From a paper:
The movement of ASTN-2 through the endolysosomal system suggests that its activity might be regulated by pH. We have determined structures of the endodomain at pH 7.5 and pH 5 and of the MACPF/CDC domain alone at pH 4, and find the regions of ASTN-2 resolved to be remarkably insensitive to acidification. In an attempt to investigate the effect of reduced pH on the ASTN-2 structure, we obtained crystals of constructs consisting of EGF-3 to the C-terminus (residues 649–1288) at pH 5 and of EGF-3 plus the MACPF domain at pH 4 (residues 649–984), though in neither case was EGF-3 resolved in the resulting structures. ASTN-2649-1288 was crystallized in 0.1 M MES, pH 5.0–6.0, 5% PEG 6000. The crystal structure of the MACPF domain C-terminus at pH 5 and of the MACPF domain alone at pH 4 were solved by molecular replacement using copy A of the structure solved at pH 7.5 in PHASER and refinement was carried out in PHENIX. The conformations of the lower pH forms of ASTN-2 are very similar to the equivalent regions of the neutral pH structure (RMSDs 0.23 Å (pH 5) and 1.52 Å (pH 4)). Yet overall these regions of ASTN-2 seem remarkably insensitive to pH suggesting that, if pH is a triggering factor in ASTN-2 activity as it moves through the endolysosomal system, the sensor is not in these parts of the structure. The junction between the EGF-4 and Fn(III) domains contains density which is not part of the ASTN-2 polypeptide and which can plausibly be modelled as an inositol triphosphate bound within a surface cavity.
Our focus here is on a PLP especially identified as being involved in neurodevelopment, astrotacin-2 (ASTN-2). ASTN-1 and ASTN-2 have been shown to interact directly with each other in vitro in a calcium-independent way with multiple regions of each protein apparently contributing to their interface. Both ASTN-1 and ASTN-2 are integral membrane proteins in which a large C-terminal domain (extracellular for ASTN-1, endosome luminal for ASTN-2) is complemented by an N-terminal cytosolic domain suspended between two transmembrane α-helices. Thus, the endosomal regions of ASTN-2 comprise a smaller N-terminal domain and a larger C-terminal domain whose structure we report here and which we refer to as its endodomain. We describe its unique combination of a canonical MACPF/CDC domain with a minimal epidermal growth factor (EGF)-like repeat (EGF-4), a previously unobserved type of fibronectin type III (Fn(III)) domain in which an additional two β-strands are folded across the core, and an annexin-like domain.
Author numbering: 717 to 887, 897 to 1058, 1063 to 1288
Write the structure that this text describes.
């Protein structure tokens, strides 16, 4: 049967790869020593439970707002006027205990199988041990009750307004409960600044009755049992072998299961895949080549004619090495069609190239994982684009492909010029007679872009619709092929633009943002069947700046 007690997972053993606790039973649980806490039963022997200080108990932290990274990976889609959808995390910890174990004798069943395997040096056998007992045992861990909530805002603007609106009316109340208060009360009203806000919570261990920051109407509870939150320290199970002969042979079997998928031995810096791990093309397949997740840049919202993308290196610390990243891109309108092919090593770092595409490599969250990036600066406005990415290893395998589809913003529109043209066109249509007027009216309408023509239609109908619709009146005064010609141009404007271009006001802000521009100093030696490691390529990186002109839509100029 399964021996289960509180604190709990410390005696059973932990796997690093699959991240599962309760993997066999490493240490024995006894109750000779008398360890109690509060209302909990008798603790197992040899584990030290220390409640955290009162400063840490029932304390909540509100993270800074960031774009929703999940909504920047696949079919990327958001209102151009809104911007990136934002998320902000709220987290409250309430029933905290720090749990270490020292000192405990080993389990009976653990030592039994440890006694028979220590002489039997076998690979398939040592792997079945790790399946059952895991790889480590937990040395230090944090237990308690934590409530993790995520506030989903529709835009960066909506949040800032809500945060300043909250900061005014509070100066008592946390930010999330103020939002939840206005979310629940919205059943009284309807549309407002809080229209699209959503809150999503997930609880590890129920909220205690004493703490008021994690209190949720019905889920309150008196003295809840603490749940494992963090694993602070792990120690490998080859510490427990007690001999040098087996604990070196066990260690190599552990590295095989972790780094080489259990189908190969690890020489320093790489996996020696035993046959037949090799794939369909006869290339080493024991170390996994992961899918690189292509992302939009969180810091640079795409503008019309411009997109900048990111991805984190898929190269493990041990095993596969990435030699190149292949990035294809096409404008759709098709499907199942191959577009421009860009090798990161050959086309982006070595061959210009510029000034339409630039690449870059940077240090990421915690080195050493690299953050590759590429920026497109000569795209076309109001166009749907598809970017695909895959990695190529040193021995030639392709990774699983990854895709991003998104649309560049609408073209820029001088709203003053549009309302000015609409008046010019109306006073010509009221002049009637001249064929110069007819030609000049047709010329000015055709010489300006389709989005501008859609905007002068919006302005003409806003003012002069009672004396004739823009289309209908253009047909009366100019003739109907010139009309139909004007009219077809309006059809080339998509209708997210056409929706946005029916707004009250369109204003232009100009953002200026940096991007990393890296080039390859050293051309690396490549063989026929093997290639050079892309990470080792020496590169010279320089910071540059893009100016990004954007339209600003709204029903009034106050933002
Ligand atoms: C859950 O479960 C597991 C539980 O254990 C966890 O698994 C552990 O993960 C750790 C983290 O990833 C692992 O630690 C990392 O190991 C790697 C691999 O190191 C081995 O190979 C190295 C390769 O050496 C090359 O170059 C030397 C020249 O000096 C040559 O001699 C070699 O031959 C080899 O290259 C060529 O080999 C042949 C030619 O012979 C050809 O095919 C090619 O030409 C090859 O290129 C090697 O350096 C290591 O050697 C150490 O160990 C020897 C004994 O085993 C010892 O004799 C050595 O002296 C050395 O020990 C000392 O030096 C190292 C390095 O300074 C120290 O780490 C160590 O503590 C000692 O001081 C080893 O054989 C290793 O590369 C990693 O090191 C990088 O990352 C750490 C960050 O942790 C940095 O601090 C380092 O500076 C280094 O960073 C540099 O390199 C990166 C790679 O390019 C680069 O990205 C960086 O920018 C920077 O340049 C780590 O040490 C650990 O091994 C692993 N354990 C097990 C049991 O699997 C798992 O992670 C965990 N998961 C969790 C917790 O989430
Ligand atoms: O050391 P060099 O001069 O750069 O060239 C090595 C050579 O191409 C080996 O054939 C190759 O191993 P295999 O062809 O057998 O796969 C090795 O890769 P590796 O050491 O990472 O295995 C390369 O490093
Ligand atoms: C349960 O605990 C006993 C110690 O009394 C131990 O002998 C037994 O092996 C444990 N059960 C399992 C499945 O490990």
């Amino acid at each position: 049967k399964f021996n289960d007690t509180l604190f709990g997972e410390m005696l059973h053993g932990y796997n690093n790869r699959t991240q599962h606790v309760n993997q066999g039973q490493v240490f024995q649980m006894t109750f000779r020593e008398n360890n109690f806490i509060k209302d909990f039963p008798q603790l197992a022997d040899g584990l030290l439970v220390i409640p955290l200080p009162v400063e840490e108990q029932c304390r909540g932290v509100l993270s800074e707002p960031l774009p929703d990274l999940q909504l920047l990976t696949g079919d990327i889609r958001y209102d151009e006027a809104m911007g990136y959808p934002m998320v902000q995390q709220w987290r409250v910890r309430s029933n905290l205990y720090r749990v270490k174990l020292s000192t405990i004798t080993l389990a009976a069943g653990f030592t039994n199988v440890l006694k028979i395997l220590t002489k039997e040096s076998s690979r398939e056998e040592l792997l079945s041990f790790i399946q059952h007992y895991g790889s480590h045992y937990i040395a230090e861990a944090l237990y308690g009750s934590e409530l993790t909530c995520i506030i989903h805002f529709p835009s960066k603007k909506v949040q800032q307004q809500l945060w300043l609106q909250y900061q005014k009316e509070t100066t008592s109340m946390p930010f999330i409960t103020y939002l939840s208060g206005l979310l629940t009360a919205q059943m009284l009203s309807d549309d407002q600044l809080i229209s699209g806000v959503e809150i999503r919570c997930e609880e590890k261990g129920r909220c205690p009755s004493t703490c008021h920051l994690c209190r949720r109407p019905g889920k309150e509870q008196l003295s809840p049992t603490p749940v494992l939150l963090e694993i602070n320290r792990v120690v490998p199970l080859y510490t427990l072998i007690q001999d040098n002969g087996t604990k070196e042979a066990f260690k190599s079997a552990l590295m095989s299961s972790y780094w080489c998928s259990g189908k190969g031995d690890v020489i320093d810096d790489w996996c020696r895949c035993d046959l037949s791990a090799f794939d369909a093309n006869g290339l080493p397949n024991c170390s996994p080549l992961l899918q690189p997740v292509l992302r939009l840049s969180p810091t640079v919202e795409p503008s019309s004619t411009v997109v900048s993308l990111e991805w984190v290196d898929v190269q493990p610390a041990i095993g596969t090495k990435v030699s190149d990243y292949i990035l294809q891109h096409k404008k759709v309108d098709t499907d199942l069609y191959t577009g421009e092919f860009l090798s990161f090593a050959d086309d982006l770092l070595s061959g210009l190239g510029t000034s339409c595409v630039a690449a870059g490599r940077s240090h990421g969250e915690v080195p050493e994982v690299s953050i590759y990036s590429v920026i497109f600066k000569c795209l076309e406005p109001d166009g749907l684009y598809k970017f695909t990415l895959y990695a190529v290893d040193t021995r030639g395998r392709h990774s699983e492909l990854s895709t991003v589809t998104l649309r560049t913003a609408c073209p820029l529109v001088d709203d003053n010029k549009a309302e000015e043209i609409a008046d010019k066109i109306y006073n010509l249509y009221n002049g009637y007679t001249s064929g110069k007027e007819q030609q000049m009216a047709y010329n000015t309408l055709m010489e300006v872009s389709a989005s501008m023509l859609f905007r002068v239609q919006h302005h003409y109908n806003s003012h002069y619709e009672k004396f004739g619709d823009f289309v209908w009146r253009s047909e009366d005064e100019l003739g109907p092929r010139k009309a139909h010609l004007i009219l077809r141009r309006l059809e080339r404007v998509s209708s997210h633009c056409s929706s946005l271009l029916r707004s009250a006001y369109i204003q232009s802000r100009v953002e200026t943002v940096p991007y990393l521009f890296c080039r390859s100093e050293e051309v690396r030696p490549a063989g026929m069947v093997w290639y050079s490691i892309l990470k080792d390529t020496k590169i010279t990186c320089e910071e540059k700046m893009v100016s990004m002109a954007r339209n600003t839509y709204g029903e009034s100029k106050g933002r």
